[PDB]
Design a protein around this ligand. Structure first.
Ligand SMILES: *[C@@H]1O[C@H](CO)[C@@H](O[C@@H]2O[C@H](CO)[C@@H](O[C@@H]3O[C@H](CO[C@H]4O[C@H](CO)[C@@H](O)[C@H](O)[C@@H]4O)[C@@H](O)[C@H](O[C@H]4O[C@H](CO)[C@@H](O)[C@H](O)[C@@H]4O[C@H]4O[C@H](CO)[C@@H](O)[C@H](O)[C@@H]4O)[C@@H]3O)[C@H](O)[C@H]2NC(C)=O)[C@H](O)[C@H]1NC(C)=O
Ligand SMILES: *[C@@H]1O[C@H](CO)[C@@H](O[C@@H]2O[C@H](CO)[C@@H](O[C@@H]3O[C@H](CO[C@H]4O[C@H](CO)[C@@H](O)[C@H](O)[C@@H]4O)[C@@H](O)[C@H](O[C@H]4O[C@H](CO)[C@@H](O)[C@H](O)[C@@H]4O)[C@@H]3O)[C@H](O)[C@H]2NC(C)=O)[C@H](O)[C@H]1NC(C)=O
Ligand SMILES: *[C@@H]1O[C@H](CO)[C@@H](O[C@@H]2O[C@H](CO)[C@@H](O[C@@H]3O[C@H](CO[C@H]4O[C@H](CO)[C@@H](O)[C@H](O)[C@@H]4O)[C@@H](O)[C@H](O[C@H]4O[C@H](CO)[C@@H](O)[C@H](O)[C@@H]4O)[C@@H]3O)[C@H](O)[C@H]2NC(C)=O)[C@H](O)[C@H]1NC(C)=O
Ligand SMILES: *[C@@H]1O[C@H](CO)[C@@H](O[C@@H]2O[C@H](CO)[C@@H](O)[C@H](O)[C@H]2NC(C)=O)[C@H](O)[C@H]1NC(C)=O
Ligand SMILES: *[C@@H]1O[C@H](CO)[C@@H](O)[C@H](O)[C@H]1NC(C)=O
Ligand SMILES: *[C@@H]1O[C@H](CO)[C@@H](O)[C@H](O)[C@H]1NC(C)=O
Ligand SMILES: *[C@@H]1O[C@H](CO)[C@@H](O)[C@H](O)[C@H]1NC(C)=O
Ligand SMILES: *[C@@H]1O[C@H](CO)[C@@H](O)[C@H](O)[C@H]1NC(C)=O
Ligand SMILES: *[C@@H]1O[C@H](CO)[C@@H](O)[C@H](O)[C@H]1NC(C)=O
Ligand SMILES: *[C@@H]1O[C@H](CO)[C@@H](O)[C@H](O)[C@H]1NC(C)=O
Ligand SMILES: *[C@@H]1O[C@H](CO)[C@@H](O)[C@H](O)[C@H]1NC(C)=O
Ligand SMILES: *[C@@H]1O[C@H](CO)[C@@H](O)[C@H](O)[C@H]1NC(C)=O
Ligand SMILES: *[C@@H]1O[C@H](CO)[C@@H](O)[C@H](O)[C@H]1NC(C)=O
Ligand SMILES: *[C@@H]1O[C@H](CO)[C@@H](O)[C@H](O)[C@H]1NC(C)=O
Ligand SMILES: *[C@@H]1O[C@H](CO)[C@@H](O)[C@H](O)[C@H]1NC(C)=O
Ligand SMILES: *[C@@H]1O[C@H](CO)[C@@H](O)[C@H](O)[C@H]1NC(C)=O
Ligand SMILES: *[C@@H]1O[C@H](CO)[C@@H](O)[C@H](O)[C@H]1NC(C)=O
Ligand SMILES: *[C@@H]1O[C@H](CO)[C@@H](O)[C@H](O)[C@H]1NC(C)=O
Ligand SMILES: *[C@@H]1O[C@H](CO)[C@@H](O)[C@H](O)[C@H]1NC(C)=O
Ligand SMILES: *[C@@H]1O[C@H](CO)[C@@H](O)[C@H](O)[C@H]1NC(C)=O
Lengths: 126, 449, 126, 126
């Protein structure tokens, strides 16, 4: 089944995790009044490289999905495994986690690939 | 044994295309300043050590007659002329009745005046009292009306005076291609400019091409190699111009024996018109010298190349222009700011069969011009003080052949021009734009698990 | 030896495969009349990200070279291994394959990393 | 400790190697007079993709740190391991190595991933 772009918006997060390769595909898409689209598609590629930079400096690089060594803080809406992927949409989840997105981002770019890669540099010399 | 596709990134693969070319004009030309001469204002400085990579084993087809760089350069120079004339003084209140008379001289009746001493009104700085001032205009600039005259461009378009700060001096301009594109250059000594080229090289920026706007006689161009070159889109077609490129330059000297004065009459508030004052010295006409010996050897070397295409044992006769506008029947060019139109009847008056001084040519001077066959913008060239002397190179011709022959073995050639794109085709014949497609797939015995 | 940008243009594909890191380097390079170069370097970076997007959605990501699991159809100019890398230039090859480039592209973006990565998602959960 | 953007500029290279994820984060940052910032953020992203292209064609791709199979030539300021990371700043080091940066870049983009990946192409088929 292929619901299309933004297809599984009202479905659970577990169900919407199957449509990751659909919203990612149509995210980049390949005299005045003609500069209207130029400045827009320039901000479009700046927004794309912005997200790609965040996805790269973290422990992912490989897009779509990646795991991390970060303990899930109970204060970030303490929910259960079966209460998130089978009872909540991505919009409803982002509405709750909007307070802690920047904190987690800081715990992802700094605490991980800056201490993990240096650890590998210490593990790869021997 | 079964092959597998593999993506290669960075393969020498290009295809013919058209893109947006930018400029380059050294670093010493920017030191010429003088309130931005010609174009060089925000132009990228030319790379001090250009690189030209000779693509060995590569044979690429060029086409000087279907080349987009010519059209781009033409539109670029046109937009340049407009941007150079937008902030200049507009001579809107200059179409007043001109009470003109002969210049102060002493006969004969065959001198036909040429110079007219016009008296007229003018608006001063204030919007009340007028101004009874006089100037000196050429006959090609005025026209009587029923002695009272008027400017020849009244019921045509507007007129703007060229600012005295800028100059019309052709400076070398290197055309370069952005990232992902490249310019191919033919480096063979006999490239008559169409078809496959044996020795092709790649460059980022072309050599210094001076935008010399001229007709009939190609001035300040690139010399040909070995034998003089003859280029035509269709030799059997007598409607297509024949671009001739020389090997040895023909020394030409043009002078303006009328060292002039600039009257700065004030059409305030702010604006100021530069009229022509009295002439200090003798009333002489502008003229151009061409060395008789050089012109003989050049013509005798060209006719020997012309016999290679119109039969070995034929008669080639030279005649001057058939008629039309002044820009086509005469050698039109710019020198020192003035616009000369020279009589080329002493150069194309010959008859060549199968087997010590200078030739002076009468040159007229026009101040109100409408080059590139443009209607809407008439530019008034301000007078230039001092005797103007200029030495140039005749490096090529633009010839046209007469039609409906059938009978007879002779061929007659006359000077042509008009389309200024031909002036750019004489330098862009050895360059062409290509786009790089580095993504190439190819099979090999490689996979994963 | 370093022939330079577009150096091995007249050489065989096998010989030109050694100059991949040269044409890739000079591919990006770091009032009117000033927007003339702006709109050009914008199309330059759009052409670059276009090729990088195609190079990413396929089974490559890592540039220069990458292998794929696609059988070479004999109808796509049935030539031999030694007749391609040692007897044909890249321009001459692209002149023949110009008909099937879009077909192969379709067999690369859709049939591979859409079925291969989902297979890995099935292989990585156990 | 987080000295901030350009924090460890006067510190040793070994100490400044801990602040790599800080200068990399603030390197991209997400009518006339309005094009003044447009042309600037366009050159900003062109400078970013330029460095990312150099970082990709080499044996790195993964940002921050990566090792290479290139012997350190003694002519490139023959210093010791403890005389570089514990007695020299990055500005002072780049002032000395400015002559050989382009040479090393040539030994990194060409000698490595063009011969190494082709070697893997020969090693991955069996
Ligand atoms: C093909 O290419 C050739 C080669 O360049 C070119 O010949 C050039 O011809 C032009 C004339 O059209 C020349 O440019 C002018 O030259 C005169 C005379 O030069 C003397 O002065 C210098 C001073 O050091 C001497 O070194 C030199 O040897 C000569 O003795 C200059 O006087 C001109 O200067 C004025 O005109 C420029 C344009 O109008 C101004 O931009 C410049 O600032 C000067 O203006 C000021 O001085 C004026 C002096 O009276 C003054 O009245 C003005 O109001 C203003 O204040 C000008 O430079 C050039 O010399 C020739 N080239 C060479 C190598 O000599 C052809 O023109 C070209 N063909 C075509 C069709 O373009
Ligand atoms: C272009 O055409 C215009 C006219 O439209 C010209 O400009 C005029 O030129 C004439 C010259 O032919 C000028 O006439 C001269 O005026 C001088 C001004 O003197 C003033 O002051 C004296 C007192 O000192 C008064 O007596 C006099 O009336 C003036 O008010 C006179 O001094 C000149 O006289 C001298 O020359 C004549 C020549 O025959 C002698 O007979 C005299 O004895 C004396 O030596 C002379 O009369 C006129 O003033 C100009 N007008 C303007 C508005 O500038 C250009 O000359 C003309 N150019 C060309 C190339 O044809
Ligand atoms: C082309 O036509 C122009 C028309 O403008 C002529 O330019 C004039 O030429 C004359 C003659 O050379 C110049 O007159 C000269 O004036 C000098 C003094 O000028 C300065 O001082 C006065 C105040 O006294 C100021 O107003 C002025 O602005 C200057 O600051 C004299 O010293 C000259 O005499 C010396 O030179 C001559 C040769 O030129 C010698 O015979 C003398 O014995 C003496 O040594 C001279 O009288 C006039 O200044 C020029 N005007 C302008 C605007 O440039 C050109 O001469 C003419 N050229 C040709 C080839 O025909
Ligand atoms: C153009 O003018 C130059 C300069 O006067 C001429 O060159 C001179 O030629 C004579 C005769 O050969 C020599 O004696 C001089 O030494 C030359 N002078 C210079 C500065 O070169 C040239 O012949 C003229 N050409 C034409 C066609 O009139
Ligand atoms: C977890 O949340 C609590 C309370 O909101 C906070 O004290 C703690 O700092 C959080 N953990 C992290 C790693 O930020
Ligand atoms: C389930 O939710 C409760 C209540 O917030 C919490 O105590 C518990 O840790 C959660 N368990 C899991 C597995 O998320
Ligand atoms: C967001 O943070 C604010 C400030 O502490 C708080 O009032 C609000 O309840 C928080 N919302 C969520 C969904 O955590
Ligand atoms: C000059 O004067 C003569 C004599 O009156 C006249 O015939 C002629 O039209 C005037 N103008 C010219 C340009 O000769
Ligand atoms: C303008 O021309 C008229 C012609 O009718 C003349 O009478 C007058 O003197 C001229 N000059 C001025 C300043 O009015
Ligand atoms: C022109 O040169 C040709 C060829 O050498 C010749 O026959 C002729 O006499 C020359 N003309 C003049 C006027 O010297
Ligand atoms: C050509 O020269 C002749 C002289 O015989 C002259 O009468 C004619 O006007 C000239 N034609 C052109 C177009 O120059
Ligand atoms: C050009 O010169 C010839 C020969 O002197 C002459 O017959 C012809 O009328 C001139 N052309 C013009 C337009 O003056
Ligand atoms: C052309 O040359 C011939 C031969 O010298 C001569 O008789 C004729 O008058 C010339 N034509 C012109 C316009 O000078
Ligand atoms: C023009 O020809 C003369 C004469 O040989 C030469 O000295 C000069 O360099 C030439 N100008 C060029 C080729 O731009
Ligand atoms: C291979 O090419 C042949 C002939 O054009 C065609 O019948 C077949 O469908 C093609 N197969 C694939 C997988 O492209
Ligand atoms: C060589 O070409 C033949 C004939 O088309 C074909 O049978 C064979 O599979 C090809 N071999 C290789 C290695 O490409
Ligand atoms: C491209 O396809 C067309 C149409 O099927 C055909 O005429 C042509 O021969 C093909 N060329 C190549 C190089 O495959
Ligand atoms: C290292 O530098 C020395 C001296 O400059 C030189 O002899 C040697 O060839 C260089 N080797 C490399 C690999 O750069
Ligand atoms: C220190 O540098 C010298 C000179 O290049 C070398 O002999 C020595 O091995 C280096 N020692 C260390 C610890 O790097
Ligand atoms: C840079 O190279 C130049 C030229 O060989 C030399 O004079 C200078 O000492 C070099 N500087 C460094 C820091 O190596």
């Amino acid at each position: 089944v292929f619901l299309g772009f933004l297809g599984a918006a009202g479905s659970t997060m577990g169900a919407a995790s199957m449509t990751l390769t659909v919203q990612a595909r149509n995210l980049l898409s390949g005299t005045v009044w003609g500069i209207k689209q130029l400045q827009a598609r320039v901000l479009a590629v700046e927004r794309y490289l912005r997200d790609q930079q965040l996805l790269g400096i973290w422990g992912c690089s490989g897009k779509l999905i990646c795991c991390t060594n970060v303990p899930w803080n109970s204060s970030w809406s303490n929910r259960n495994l079966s209460e998130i992927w089978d009872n909540m949409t991505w919009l409803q989840w982002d509405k709750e986690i909007s307070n802690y997105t920047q904190i987690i981002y800081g715990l992802l770019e700094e605490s991980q690939n800056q201490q993990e890669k240096n650890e590998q540099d210490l593990l790869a010399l021997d | 044994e079964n092959l597998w596709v593999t993506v290669y990134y960075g393969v020498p693969v290009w295809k013919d295309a058209e893109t947006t070319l930018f400029c380059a004009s050294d670093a010493k030309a920017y030191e010429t300043e003088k309130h931005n001469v010609w174009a060089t204002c925000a132009c990228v400085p030319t790379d001090p050590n250009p690189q030209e990579i000779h693509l060995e084993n590569v044979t690429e087809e060029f086409n000087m007659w279907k080349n987009n760089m010519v059209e781009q350069m033409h539109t670029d120079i046109i937009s340049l002329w407009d941007q150079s004339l937008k902030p200049c003084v507009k001579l809107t209140p200059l179409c007043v009745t001109l009470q003109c008379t002969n210049v102060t001289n002493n006969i004969t009746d065959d001198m036909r005046g040429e110079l007219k001493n016009c008296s007229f009104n003018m608006t001063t700085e204030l919007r009340d009292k007028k101004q009874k001032v006089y100037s000196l205009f050429y006959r090609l600039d005025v026209v009587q009306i029923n002695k009272e005259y008027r400017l020849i461009n009244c019921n045509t378009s507007a007129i703007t005076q060229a600012c005295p700060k800028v100059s019309f001096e052709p400076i070398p301009i290197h055309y370069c291609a952005p990232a992902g594109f490249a310019i191919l250059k033919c480096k063979d000594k006999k490239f008559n400019g169409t078809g496959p080229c044996p020795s092709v090289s790649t460059v980022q920026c072309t050599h210094g091409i001076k935008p010399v706007v001229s007709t009939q006689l190609l001035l300040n161009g690139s010399l040909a190699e070995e034998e003089v070159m003859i280029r035509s889109e269709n030799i059997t077609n007598n409607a297509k111009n024949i671009l001739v490129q020389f090997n040895t330059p023909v020394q030409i000297n043009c002078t303006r024996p009328n060292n002039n004065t600039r009257k700065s009459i004030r059409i305030g508030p702010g604006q100021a018109f530069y009229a022509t004052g009295d002439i200090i010295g003798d009333i002489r006409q502008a003229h151009c010298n061409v060395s008789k010996a050089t012109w003989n050897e050049t013509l005798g070397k060209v006719v020997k190349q012309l016999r290679k295409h119109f039969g070995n044992n034929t008669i080639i006769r030279f005649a001057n222009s058939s008629g039309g506008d002044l820009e086509v029947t005469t050698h039109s060019f710019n020198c020192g700011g003035e616009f000369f139109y020279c009589n080329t009847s002493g150069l194309f008056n010959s008859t060549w069969i199968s087997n010590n001084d200078s030739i002076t040519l009468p040159c007229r001077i026009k101040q109100i011009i409408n080059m590139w066959q443009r209607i809407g913008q008439a530019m008034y060239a301000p007078p230039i003080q001092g005797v103007i002397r200029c030495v140039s190179n005749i490096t090529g011709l633009i010839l046209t052949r007469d039609g409906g022959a059938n009978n007879t073995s002779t061929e007659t050639f006359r000077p042509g021009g008009g389309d200024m794109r031909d002036n750019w085709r004489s330098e862009l014949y050895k360059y062409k734009v290509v786009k790089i497609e580095p993504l190439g797939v190819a099979p090999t015995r490689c996979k994963r698990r």
